[PDB]
Design a protein around this ligand. Structure first.
Ligand code: NA
Ligand code: NA
Ligand code: NI
Ligand code: NI
Lengths: 423, 423
């Protein structure tokens, strides 16, 4: 049967181009709300209003930091004084602002729209924030987990911006100007480039009227047209093998595979869902392969396999702590060589599909998951997204399709093997 | 108004003494179930059936490991093949077994009762598991976070078993015998010493009948009488200051305060709730003290203040990463010296009460929280526990009571300051 959620999903588009999705769930105390923009760390270059721009790295994340500045509000206290709290993040391809709370939802939604739809930059506070971000960048270059990850990306990618960390570099952050920040904010923070998604214990009629009234009272420009400009990234890694020494107390191994290109909308949903099942079957905590590695002390319970897919890039990562990183790397390559020769085992595949169907069903209980995922798939091109779309891929996915995905993507020539070794 | 939950809470006691609480929430896909025993790492000594016993440390946790052994089941696969997964933990004063899943809840509850109500020990598999636990103990002595924590406890406590880690030592684990394990299992795993709590998308009439039928078909002994035997722990620390060097990349500071004794039931609920509010007001992420420490680079966002209270002990812990551990320790003591002289600031206190009321209200949305907390407070003596009890303490708590709690407990003579310094 097609997925029937127990609650209403109300999705419409405002006069100013903003898409809104409300999921009222009256039995819950929490409301969780997210306002996000289709703009992230990888949007280095773009054309808008007839001109080509190439920015220093770091702008999406700089704007995130500065979004909370307001001469007429402590933004965090405005939420907190009325029973909610607010946070944000920047990722590769979107920036998100979100709160959760238990009452006065009308006020909080108003505050969320208001603080994201105005920016307050001065030459002074742009200078101040550069120092704060440079420091954050230095600290994060000393974090071993983040370092191993960034070494893999740097090895994998020749030119794609994903090879630079989300905050940028010290050099690039230092070159950012107020003018650039304002250009990017005006270009990407238009409501036509954004999405507002809310789930939990709120009155949908009440909140829908508050949003319309808030937006109707503001004045927006014509929507900017954006041509996204990205390089022709080679399908092979820049370096296929890397190791380095770092003050870590045990070795760490990361093996990755590079997608030749990104994906959009329903294609992205299908490929992402298919990898979730495949990686669980190959590497998951209930796989005989994982149990054999654990029994042999080659991994610990923090071992994981993850997939990341966006419009202009994608990759698989597998690994974790590895007392014998060479041995673990060999076992992974052997495992894959056998599946490559012999085909995916059907029984492991059906157990995986059933685990992931359950995991998704249970996750649809959570306001945060419902919201985050509606936002994420919408902005990545599923303009009419529905969770039934995910469930339906989980139901209809086949062993042939699992084999084709494996053959396409988990290969030797698009693979990077990288290690961090104790100093 | 007294708290009204949106769902039914059905609490009764079976013929064999087991207390069951079901919280059906029909709108949810997940059911989360926990079967726990009032027995943990600190129950080193006890009297039962007319005899005094003193055990080697480690038994609660040894039984946890061995509970999953079954000649007629892969216990994990029994849950997994029908859309659930199972795990367990041992803590100071209870051991818990739990699953979450999306269907065939009747089967899973049956499997949960069945695998916890029989144990399958052999001289052989007791030997095997000793090696596995000794290794786990060695690994955990090399984990810096766990090490700093255990150094604090070892400094704080003279004789109380809480000073030994949950798994015991290599020596004590090695002295454990099958006979002892069986004695502790027979004594503490009787249904009269346990609790079963289930929340989520299940039929309460269906599951209540399955539980009664499962228990009615088994044969239980007369409930063992247990006299809990614990030492007269001094109210002052064994050592009030400690530092050590460890392969860590930044220093870590932990400051703790020792309760003179533990608490029971409604007294424990009140004191635990009161500390949650107080610690947030003193040290929380929205406190001016915390913001001043962060602005000065004396802490990072992993800084935290936590409270632990049980029937026979309790303590407060505050700290985290500390680039200047001496300076941070001084600032904490100064902060507390001013509040000690001047009284708790009322405005910070009301903001804290409102944050924690919200946090609790939002947490009551979660099957896992509802279940874990019902279990925990019940086993610690709130024999008629209700979440309204917690909410009511949050509503009625006063500034005078916050000052009295502070004066009683956050003092200089029951305080331990400890640091781990980079090698
Ligand atoms: Na703003
Ligand atoms: Na068992
Ligand atoms: Ni940042
Ligand atoms: Ni263990």
């Amino acid at each position: 049967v097609s997925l029937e959620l127990p609650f209403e999903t109300r999705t419409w588009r405002l006069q100013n181009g903003l898409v809104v999705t409300l999921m009222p769930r009256p039995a819950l105390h929490q409301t969780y709300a997210m306002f996000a923009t289709r703009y992230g760390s990888v949007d280095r270059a773009f054309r808008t209003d007839g001109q080509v721009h190439e920015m220093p790295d770091g702008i999406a994340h700089f704007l995130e930091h500065k979004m909370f500045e307001d001469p007429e509000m402590d933004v965090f206290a405005r939420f907190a004084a009325h029973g909610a709290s607010v946070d944000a993040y920047t990722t590769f391809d979107h920036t998100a602002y979100y709160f959760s709370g238990t009452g006065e939802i009308a006020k909080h939604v108003g505050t969320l729209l208001d603080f994201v739809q105005s920016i307050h930059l001065t030459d002074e506070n742009v200078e101040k924030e550069k120092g704060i971000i440079a420091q954050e960048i230095h600290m994060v270059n000393d974090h071993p987990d983040r370092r191993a990850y960034m070494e893999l990306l740097r090895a994998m990618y020749h030119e794609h911006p994903v090879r630079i960390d989300i905050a940028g570099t010290v050099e690039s952050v230092r070159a950012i100007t107020k003018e650039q920040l304002l250009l990017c904010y005006d270009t990407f923070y238009h409501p036509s480039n954004m999405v507002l998604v809310i789930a939990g214990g709120f009155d949908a009629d009440e909140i829908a009227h508050v949003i319309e009234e808030n937006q109707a009272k503001k004045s927006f420009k014509e929507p900017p047209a954006i041509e996204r400009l990205y390089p022709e990234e080679p399908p092979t890694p820049a370096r296929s093998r890397h190791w380095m020494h770092f003050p870590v107390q045990q070795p760490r191994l990361l093996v990755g595979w590079k997608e030749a290109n990104g994906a959009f909308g329903s294609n992205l949903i299908e490929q992402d869902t298919a990898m979730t099942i495949l990686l669980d079957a190959l590497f998951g905590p209930t796989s005989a392969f994982y149990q054999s590695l654990l029994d042999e002390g080659l991994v610990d319970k923090g071992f994981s396999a993850n997939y990341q897919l966006s419009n202009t890039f994608g990759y698989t990562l597998v690994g974790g702590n590895a007392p014998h990183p060479d041995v673990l790397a060999e076992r992974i390559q052997s495992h894959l060589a056998r599946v490559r020769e012999r085909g995916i085992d059907e029984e492991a595949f059906e157990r995986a599909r059933k685990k992931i169907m359950g995991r998704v069903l249970m996750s649809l209980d959570q306001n945060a998951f419902l919201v985050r995922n509606w936002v994420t798939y919408f902005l990545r091109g599923a303009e009419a997204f529905a969770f039934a779309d995910v469930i339906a891929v989980l139901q209809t996915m086949t062993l042939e399709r699992a084999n084709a995905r494996f053959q396409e993507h988990l290969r030797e020539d698009n693979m990077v093997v990288s290690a961090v070794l104790p100093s």
